[PDB]
């Protein structure tokens, strides 16, 4: 029914408005709705700046069970030192509004990338995907994942080498996970932009050493970005290969042979999927789908890159293939409902790795969905 599709498109602004009102009401009416454990970490990290206790910092106020640390790169603390100058509520409401606006802007950038501009459809997409498990997880925790997605797609949209390079470098300096997006630029043969993005990431490392130095150092040696310190590896929310393999195993294999084989097979699948795509949005979406699978820690709130992927599926060049519609609706039903969020209740505690067949096998849900999408893209491209 394309008529109903047009009717709902016309009802965009007054559906995104409803979604934003509902989200804002929930956050500031329910206890722990505006808890913002990761925004409070970003605010209390730099708040201790200049006192030699920034990475030894722990934040158990909001989750006594698990003390939230400041695992971000020191450049993130440099960037968040201004947040120390803003009252907590004036920053919480600002951050929620910023994440919402970043979601709308990234949807608009995805539409532009696909070759069409549609403010109403962008509002509808923002409202519908606002409640996808990754987006609601980011909003709940205050984690900056929509903002970095916006920065990365802004870099992709801008053909100018310096703009894209600087955006990618700064965004990757704030968090190391989005650095995998740079690989897309390697695939796009944008060698100069990739070089500049790497240079900016190194200059962000230098800034972090300068400002947050003498307290946060050796961030790559003796630490290796160890997944354990960031958080539990086996918890179902950790939807990377490592999380699901640990669930089905009962013990974190980590760099084990069996995890390495999975890493290699997903590497080949993602490379074939990218080889099966030709448009910027699809290429970046495949690259980030692979990044979410290879990173040692990829919580649900990291999987906000799926939203541009669904936009590509339902509007990109493959808005006709039977498989394209099938997998777009599959991703929508999976994320909107959220299997990992539902399964997280079954496990005794976030630190329990042993699982029976149901709670372990169902823990491979998002991994299996991503691998199925990658294999489908590879086979359809090869054919």
């Amino acid at each position, epitope marked *: 029914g394309a008529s109903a599709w047009r009717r709902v498109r016309a009802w965009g602004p007054w559906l995104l408005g409803l979604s934003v009102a509902v989200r804002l009401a929930w956050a500031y009416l329910t206890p722990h709705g505006a808890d913002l454990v990761d925004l409070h970490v970003y605010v209390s990290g730099p708040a201790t700046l200049g006192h030699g206790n920034l990475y030894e910092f722990t934040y158990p106020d909001k989750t006594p069970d698990f003390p939230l640390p400041f695992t971000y790169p020191p450049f993130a603390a440099v960037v968040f030192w201004p947040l120390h100058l803003i009252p907590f509520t004036l920053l919480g409401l600002c951050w929620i509004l910023g994440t919402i606006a970043a979601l709308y802007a990234v949807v608009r950038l995805s539409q532009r990338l696909l070759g069409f501009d549609d403010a109403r459809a962008a509002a509808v997409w923002t409202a519908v995907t606002m409640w996808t498990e990754p987006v609601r997880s980011t909003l709940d925790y205050g984690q900056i994942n929509v903002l970095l997605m916006l920065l990365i797609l802004l870099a992709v949209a801008s053909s100018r080498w310096w*703009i894209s390079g600087t955006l990618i470098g700064l965004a990757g300096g704030v968090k190391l996970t989005p650095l995998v997006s740079g690989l897309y630029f390697l695939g796009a043969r944008r060698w100069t932009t990739a070089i500049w993005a790497g240079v900016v990431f190194l200059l962000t490392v230098v800034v972090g050493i300068a400002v947050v130095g003498e307290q946060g150092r050796y961030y790559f040696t003796d630490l290796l970005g160890k997944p354990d310190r960031i958080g539990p590896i086996a918890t179902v929310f950790n939807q990377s290969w490592r999380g699901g393999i640990s669930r089905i195993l009962g013990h974190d294999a980590g760099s084990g042979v069996l995890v390495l084989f999975a890493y290699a097979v997903t590497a080949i699948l993602a490379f074939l999927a990218w080889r099966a795509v030709n448009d910027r949005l699809g290429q970046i979406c495949v690259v980030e789908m692979f990044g979410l699978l290879i990173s040692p820690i990829s919580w649900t709130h990291h999987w906000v890159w799926m939203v541009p992927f669904m936009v590509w599926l339902l509007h990109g060049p493959w808005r006709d293939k039977v498989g394209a519609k099938v997998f777009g609706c599959g991703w929508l039903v999976l994320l909107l409902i959220g299997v990992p969020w539902l399964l997280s209740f079954a496990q005794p505690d976030i630190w329990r790795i042993d699982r029976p067949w149901p709670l372990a096998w169902a823990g491979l849900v998002d991994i299996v969905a991503a691998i199925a999408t990658l294999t489908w893209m590879a086979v359809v491209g090869r054919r």
Partner: antibody
Amino acid sequence: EVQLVESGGGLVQPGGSLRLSCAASGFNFYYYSIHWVRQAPGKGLEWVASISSSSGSTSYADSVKGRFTISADTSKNTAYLQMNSLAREDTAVYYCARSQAVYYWDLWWSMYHTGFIYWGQGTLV
Amino acid sequence: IQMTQSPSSLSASVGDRVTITCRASQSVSSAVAWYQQKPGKAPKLLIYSASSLYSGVPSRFSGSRSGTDFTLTISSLQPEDFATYYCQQSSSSLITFGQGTKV
């Protein structure tokens, strides 16, 4: 498969109105920008209108500004361009073509169409 | 935006490479396309973004950015490839097709 059909192209008195209609088949208007290009006898092509059909932004030339108002119809896949006080020198062959509009963010948005991939037949306005 | 192209009928010989200029003022990046229009028909797009040819267009066709200037080059007129060729700049504000140029 993909076809473009133009049912307009009537004859009008100097001053008046005329409604060109460019039916489309095999693709979705919303995903492409429909353009109207005219070509007077003895002269070359001249761009007339560049509706986007998704954002609804209407772009038409300066000498075209005061005499044209290009519409759109995504439901029926038609362009539906309109004139008023025309026929001073507007006798031409108004083709209609679609194009893919690709955007870049050079600190501010700058649309540019990739090119008129598919063209309809000729009209006789 | 004032716009002009090469003189019409600047290459009439058959069996040789043909060149043509797409003089454009201001700066339109790579938003230039070239079209083939046989008389009594509708133009057929040849190259999009002035660098890559369209699908189905013979591989002999090739357009290249000569700075702010644009050119269209093919192999020859072996398969009776004679028609009036046009080039435009697509800045999304005011599209101009320039002067008509016959093969």
